[PDB]
RNA sequence: AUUAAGACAUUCGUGAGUGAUUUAUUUCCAUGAAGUGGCGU
């Protein structure tokens, strides 16, 4: 998709030839992928109600974590910096 | 006046009749409508 990168395009197959595949997601990224990192969000209650407000919660999170990783959130009042930048200015601090 | 004289190789006659420039062949192969957020710790 068009910013497939942060999340508009997860697919998962179900059925190959009409026969179930028990693929397990965690062995396959580990396999694929030089770092995969698990976040357990806090699913409250609901998860039987609201799709909408599932993917509001996990698409607020991610815009979140990634503007905290290459920015800063300069957002209602908390100040945490940018770990790109905090990455860079602490490795051969130049 | 002499084994001489006389005599168009000529008349008639369609290079014509029959016969598809047709048969076979993918305008196709490769290819992300995608990338990035920025601003006041």
Same mark, same amino acid.
């Given at each position: 998709?068009?910013?497939?990168?942060?999340?508009?395009? #997860?697919?998962?197959?179900?059925?190959?030839? =009409?026969?179930?595949? $028990? +693929?397990? *997601?965690? &062995? /396959?990224?580990?396999? =694929?992928?030089? !770092? *995969? @990192?698990?976040?357990?969000?806090?699913?409250?209650?609901?998860? /039987? %109600? &609201?799709? $909408? @407000?599932?993917? =509001?919660?996990?698409?607020?999170? $991610?815009?979140? &974590? @990634?503007?905290?990783?290459?920015?800063?959130?300069?957002?209602?009042?908390?100040?945490?910096?940018?770990? %790109? !930048? +905090?990455?860079?200015? #602490?490795? @051969?601090? =130049?």
């Amino acid at each position: 998709g068009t910013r497939n990168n942060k999340g508009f395009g #997860s697919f998962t197959v179900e059925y190959i030839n =009409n026969q179930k595949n $028990i +693929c397990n *997601v965690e &062995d /396959t990224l580990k396999e =694929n992928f030089a !770092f *995969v @990192y698990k976040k357990k969000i806090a699913l409250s209650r609901q998860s /039987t %109600l &609201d799709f $909408i @407000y599932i993917y =509001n919660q996990i698409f607020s999170t $991610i815009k979140k &974590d @990634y503007q905290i990783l290459k920015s800063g959130y300069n957002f209602r009042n908390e100040y945490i910096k940018s770990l %790109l !930048f +905090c990455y860079f200015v #602490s490795k @051969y601090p =130049n």
